[PDB]
Amino acid sequence: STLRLLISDSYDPWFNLAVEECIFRQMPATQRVLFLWRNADTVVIGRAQNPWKECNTRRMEEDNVRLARRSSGGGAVFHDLGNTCFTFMAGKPEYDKTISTSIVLNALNALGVSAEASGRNDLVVKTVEGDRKVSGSAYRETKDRGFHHGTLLLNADLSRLANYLNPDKKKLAAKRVTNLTELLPGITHEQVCEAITEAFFAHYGERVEAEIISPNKTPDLPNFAETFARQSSWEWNFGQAPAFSHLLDERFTWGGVELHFDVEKGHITRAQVFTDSLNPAPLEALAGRLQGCLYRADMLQQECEALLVDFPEQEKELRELSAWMAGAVR
Ligand SMILES: O=C(O)CCCC[C@@H]1CCSS1
Numbered sequence: 001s002t003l004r005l006l007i008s009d010s011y012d013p014w015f016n017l018a019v020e021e022c023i024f025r026q027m028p029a030t031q032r033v034l035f036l037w038r039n040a041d042t043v044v045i046g047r048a049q050n051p052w053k054e055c056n057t058r059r060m061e062e063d064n065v066r067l068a069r070r071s072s073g074g075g076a077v078f079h080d081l082g083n084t085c086f087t088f089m090a091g092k093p094e095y096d097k098t099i100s101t102s103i104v105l106n107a108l109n110a111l112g113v114s115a116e117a118s119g120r121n122d123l124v125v126k127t128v129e130g131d132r133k134v135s136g137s138a139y140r141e142t143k144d145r146g147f148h149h150g151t152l153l154l155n156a157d158l159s160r161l162a163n164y165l166n167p168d169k170k171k172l173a174a175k176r177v178t179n180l181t182e183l184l185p186g187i188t189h190e191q192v193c194e195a196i197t198e199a200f201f202a203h204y205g206e207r208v209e210a211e212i213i214s215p216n217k218t219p220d221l222p223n224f225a226e227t228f229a230r231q232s233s234w235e236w237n238f239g240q241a242p243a244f245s246h247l248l249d250e251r252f253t254w255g256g257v258e259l260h261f262d263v264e265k266g267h268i269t270r271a272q273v274f275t276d277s278l279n280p281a282p283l284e285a286l287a288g289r290l291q292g293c294l295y296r297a298d299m300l301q302q303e304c305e306a307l308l309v310d311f312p313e314q315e316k317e318l319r320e321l322s323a324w325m326a327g328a329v330r
Contacts, residue, residue: 013039029091
């Protein structure tokens with residue numbers, strides 16, 4: 001029918017991600033999907049980050065910690081088995097975000113916990129010592145569909161991300177969480193799955209069998225095998241470190257940018273751009289128009305700025321980029 005209920009039985013974060021990417025882009029928004037999963041120890045970076053700058057890869061290797069590059073913008077995120085995770089997808093105009101939020105809150109409520117929406121992402125519980133975050137999430141609407149996923153903090157090690165990242169000095173020179181463990185001592189991932197599952201089946205008035213997917217056999221999602229292959233490949237997750245002879249970076253209110261490149265005979269011969277900005281598009285397309293560019297403040301500014309007409313949301317981002325570059329050349 002309409003509802004699909006997908007339960008990963010696998011801690012493999014490339015498998016879980018592929019599944020996530022299949023929902024966003026393979027499944028028809030004719031379905032209403034709840035997907036519940038969790039990853040073993042993993043840093044997940046945004047698609048335009050450079051992990052050889054951002055992460056302590058040596059420690060990661062030593063401590064056996066996985067890397068995975070999601071396909072969306074933004075920065076690095078930790079996972080362990082003490083995070084329970086949820087993905088909802090459904091089609092429009094039927095579905096908006098308040099729906100999945102509703103479902104999660106009910107389920108928390110059904111666990112003895114009352115929490116609520118704090119800001120645009122998180123859910124928070126009210127505490128004698130103030131607001132304390134239990135759940136981060138992220139949302140996007142598309143043409144045919146909306147998509148919502150997030151994490152519930154059951155028993156995560158928070159502070160671990162620190163040891164796998166690297167000192168970013170500029171990001172440094174420029175700048176409240178609790179586990180459920182602490183409130184319900186016996187709470188399991190399975191238990192927190194039933195809860196959400198029911199709040200889900202409650203909202204829609206129906207139930208369906210759970211599909212227990214794991215990577216030892218193809219889940220029933222179109223093009224999964226290709227999707228899992230790419231998503232798990234070293235070249236996608238890591239990629240070679242960038243090797244060029246010039247570097248420019250800067251931290252901005254809206255993110256860090258490293259710009260790498262070569263100059264021969266006064267023009268750029270190759271160039272690459274990383275960032276942790278929520279939307280990397282306009283940087284991605286910047287590197288795109290920087291190849292061949294006359295290496296001089298005026299042309300760099302010119303190329304940067306021709307991008308405006310197709311990035312009206314990001315006009316400030318571009319302006320500051322332009323400015324920065326001009327000032328940064330000599
Ligand atoms: O992580 C973010 O900041 C954006 C998440 C947007 C969800 C997309 C749907 C399938 S994987 S990426």
